[PDB]
């Protein structure tokens, strides 16, 4: 009946991250979490919480915590926030307007950029409508951009919806990969299983 530390190491220090269009979610429960330790970790150049101060998180208990993680390029980090628009916020990973969690991001050029490009990190370029908050769309159907059906064949007005980042070490920080972790806190009519120290 011993309470263990939450496995944040498995999220923040995973060898590879998911593509943003297929963003990973880790459900965290029945453990003790030290959020102030994460907050004071200097390599987290982006650490932002909404409606709550990051040092208050250690005083709170929740039913579950969700850790979403993925990779985007540097100049898209600002889209991982409530009320944002753009290709990532609209078509890949959407936060709700009333979000009250935290967003963490750090440069991952050394891990995710590859000589010759890392084309395995992808994002959705074409989509007909915006994602709902916390929606994950992994469809690879040919995108119909005209009045004629595509029938699964790319061509005029018929495009593959996913595009590769192709991360390379020689890109500037705006186009280098950044690993992102989004923490959401869930409160239900149930005993809380995740508390701070």
């Amino acid at each position, epitope marked *: 009946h011993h309470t263990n530390l939450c496995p944040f190491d498995e999220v923040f220090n995973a060898t590879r991250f998911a593509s943003v269009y297929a963003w990973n979610r880790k459900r965290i429960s029945n453990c003790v979490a030290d959020y102030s330790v994460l907050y004071n970790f200097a390599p987290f150049f982006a650490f932002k919480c909404y409606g709550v101060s990051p040092t208050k998180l250690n005083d709170l208990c929740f039913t579950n915590v969700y850790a979403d993680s993925f990779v985007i390029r540097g*100049n898209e980090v600002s889209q991982i926030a409530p009320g944002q*628009t*753009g290709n990532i916020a*609209d*078509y890949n990973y959407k936060l709700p307007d009333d979000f009250t969690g935290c967003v963490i991001a750090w440069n991952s050029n050394k891990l995710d950029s590859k000589v010759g490009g890392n084309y395995n990190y992808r994002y959705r*370029l*074409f*989509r*007909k*409508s*915006n994602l709902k908050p916390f929606e994950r769309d992994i469809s690879t159907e040919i*995108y*119909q*951009a*005209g*009045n004629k059906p595509c029938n699964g064949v790319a061509g*005029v*007005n018929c*495009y593959f919806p996913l*595009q590769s*980042y*192709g991360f*390379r070490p*020689t*890109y*500037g920080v*705006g*186009h280098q990969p950044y690993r992102v972790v989004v923490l959401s806190f869930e409160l239900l009519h149930a005993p809380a299983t995740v508390c701070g120290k």
Partner: antibody
Amino acid sequence: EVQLLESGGGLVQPGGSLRLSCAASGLTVRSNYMNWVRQAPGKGLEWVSLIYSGGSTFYADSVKGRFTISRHDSKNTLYLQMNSLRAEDTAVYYCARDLVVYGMDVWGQGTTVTVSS
Amino acid sequence: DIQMTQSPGTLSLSPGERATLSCRASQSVSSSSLAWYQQKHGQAPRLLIYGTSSRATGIPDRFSGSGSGTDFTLTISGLEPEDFAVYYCQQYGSSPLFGGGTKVEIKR
């Protein structure tokens, strides 16, 4: 038959308003990134406004607060509402379909806007 | 804010010669975010090259593109009379951003 056809350009005095239209065929404005791009006399191309298929809109700083991009899905037509026009808004205005990684592959012929007293 | 600079402002070459147009970005960017457009006098622009090196539909083989990071090049291997026009590069950052353009004129 993939083409874009602008209209609505003309002469307006400073401070006036003007609404441009861009009728599409083949491609559907509802499903595409669509741009307005202008060119002042003897100058280069300047991107002005963008609308996503999902509805998000973006504007150049030079037209923020004054221009509004929109579309009519059934009419398959793109619009640019231009308010509080200034002399430096005088240009040929092009609409274009944007494929981003595949470039702006379809361009209209342009419609001319002249702002002068 | 990224900045795109094209050089030279005017390129004077004879028909049949190899043309090299430069487009430089103030920040090192992916080659998939850089495109080239051709504009003849009195006409609308038309897409020439997308993704730094891919020719758009109907563009002849004498047009080629290359570059990496900050320095991008449009090459015309043997200028034809119709090729003498203005060429714009364009980068996809926070928004589409066009370079200032290079005019290719006939040297006689």
